[PDB]
Amino acid sequence: GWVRPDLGELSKVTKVKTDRPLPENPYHSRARPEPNPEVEGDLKPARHGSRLFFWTM
Amino acid sequence: MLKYIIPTMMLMPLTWLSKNSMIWINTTLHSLLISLTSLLLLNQFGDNSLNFSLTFFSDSLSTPLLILTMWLLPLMLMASQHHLSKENLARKKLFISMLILLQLFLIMTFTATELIFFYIMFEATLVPTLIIITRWGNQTERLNAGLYFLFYTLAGSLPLLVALIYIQNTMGSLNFLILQYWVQPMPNSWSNTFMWLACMMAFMVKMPLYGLHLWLPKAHVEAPIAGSMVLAAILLKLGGYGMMRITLLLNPITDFMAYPFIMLSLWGMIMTSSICLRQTDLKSLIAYSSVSHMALVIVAILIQTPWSYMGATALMIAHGLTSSMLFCLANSNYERVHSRTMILARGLQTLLPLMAAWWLLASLTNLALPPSINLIGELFVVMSTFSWSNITIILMGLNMVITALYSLYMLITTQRGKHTHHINNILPSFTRENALMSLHMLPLLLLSLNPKIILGPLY
Lengths: 57, 459
Ligand SMILES: CCCCCCCCCCCCCCCCCC(=O)OC[C@H](COP(=O)([O-])OC[C@H](O)COP(=O)([O-])OC[C@H](COC(=O)CCCCCCCCCCCCCCCCC)OC(=O)CCCCCCCCCCCCCCCCC)OC(=O)CCCCCCCCCCCCCCCCC
Ligand SMILES: CCCCCCCCCCCCCCCCCC(=O)OC[C@H](COP(=O)([O-])OC[C@H](O)COP(=O)([O-])OC[C@H](COC(=O)CCCCCCCCCCCCCCCCC)OC(=O)CCCCCCCCCCCCCCCCC)OC(=O)CCCCCCCCCCCCCCCCC
Description:
The structure is cut from a larger assembly and holds chains A and B. Chain A is largely without helices or strands.
């Protein structure tokens, strides 16, 4: 009683019911480095300008 | 200080928009007005310096140099308008513009609050003087005169540039007002030794130091008259001004590092005065005299007592006026005999009596005749060096002997004796030449009546 599968069927992506848990860290990655802190706050002007030796702005 | 920078910059449309016959009159008139206004810098106080803005200040050291700088421009315009009378109009306006641009760089060289802006202006003053010497000079070797001028003044100033930025990174500022209160004692080390040399050798070239002075009896000799006037009156004095600003930061390493330079100046004021006793060239004699008189200013800065700084600033102002007048006298005879040989035309009191009187006054102020401010500066530097070491009075008095000797030998050779038979183009003294001599000598004589305005920040 076995029907041979049609052209297209055996290459389908199927779904599988499992009773094993999902591997939570299959790559065994350690803790990620903490990122550099972003910038936050409004942009105040430069305190007394460029401060390049004598240029007051 | 902007109220003098802006009229100095308005002298450029005043000289480029004038009628072709009006370019000397207008520039002379308005530069005399700027020099009239320059006396408003005399608002000085016994405690505080006249601190205008973040960029400019003017204490009692920079103030007489500013009045002298703003006064020297009309005198250079009067002095140069005869030998350029056959010049192209556009080149004539370019000459006037180089003089105005040099004035503009000088009057914010002396008022620079911050020391790297002092450095930028202090090295910007070279390039108009460069163009004046090596464009409107006289003989063949004017290009070797400016080449050794530009090489010596930049090879000395180059370690000064690294030294001032090293002060900027370490102290935080090159404001002189800030560094009055944040100066730290500079100890004995080799790093601080080369620090002291980098801060000092630039102004040692610009004074000039004896041994570093060989650019000067070519840069003054091959220059035209306005170039020689501004070189002997202001551009030598930039070194004394920079030393008096920079020895604030160089204590107490100066108190044992100044000894070989004190020896060089105390012996070079003897050597260059002896050299003045044997000059065939009149303009060279005035040049070596300028070296011999600036050697005392170097000694008085390096021993750093109050009497020494008072005498050194008095001697800088007095020598600026006196040497400018002596170069103008030498040009007044060069415009007649077309040679700078001092032995060529003699006996000129028999032909020019009033000009011989101006020669006599300039010679008496050259040899520091009291009560001139020449003698006030000379005498105070001698007092402070006698306090420094009692044996230095021998070198000081011997220098004063040779100074009076070459001054009166210049007077005897140029003005006295038998006149030259084969020279017959000796014109009567023009009104322009006597106006030039009087506008030199009369301010110098008036400053003897009230000498306290030219005695620096610690009068
Ligand atoms: C109510 C609404 C309306 C209000 C209107 C109010 C104003 C009304 C008038 C409108 C026009 C305004 C014009 C600008 C304002 C005044 C700026 C000013 O004077 O600044 C003082 C400025 C700093 O002095 P301050 O006392 O500390 O500040 C006073 C104010 O607070 C200055 O303010 P600050 O401190 O905030 O300034 C910021 C900063 C202040 O500066 C600094 O922090 C110091 C560093 C400045 C640069 C230094 C560089 C040094 C090395 C290079 C030198 C180059 C050679 C010199 C020039 C050669 C000849 C071309 O500026 C700069 O750094 C800019 C660079 C310098 C340019 C200054 C403006 C020039 C405009 C006109 C140019 C015309 C040609 C003139 C010659 C060109 C060179 C100036 O002075 C200098 O730096 C010395 C130079 C003189 C400045 C220019 C004067 C402008 C007028 C010129 C008239 C004559 C022209 C003749 C023909 C052309 C030349 C042959
Ligand atoms: C603020 C108000 C002030 C008011 C008062 C003024 C203060 C003094 C200012 C200057 C004064 C003299 C200026 C002219 C002389 C130079 C040119 C000349 O010789 O022409 C000859 C000519 C007449 O002679 P000439 O027969 O036709 O021709 C002469 C021959 O060519 C042949 O020529 P020569 O060889 O026979 O003649 C040259 C002869 C040559 O004489 C000498 O070689 C002998 C001089 C040295 C030894 C004697 C003096 C030693 C020092 C002691 C005295 C001073 C202190 C006294 C106090 C008590 C003791 C501490 O010099 C004189 O005769 C001039 C006499 C006065 C000499 C002053 C010291 C000069 C020596 C070098 C500097 C010394 C240190 C500085 C002293 C500063 C004193 C203020 O004179 C005039 O035409 C004079 C014109 C008007 C002059 C106005 C002066 C003021 C200008 C300032 C304007 C702004 C303020 C307003 C004041 C207005 C006042 C009216």
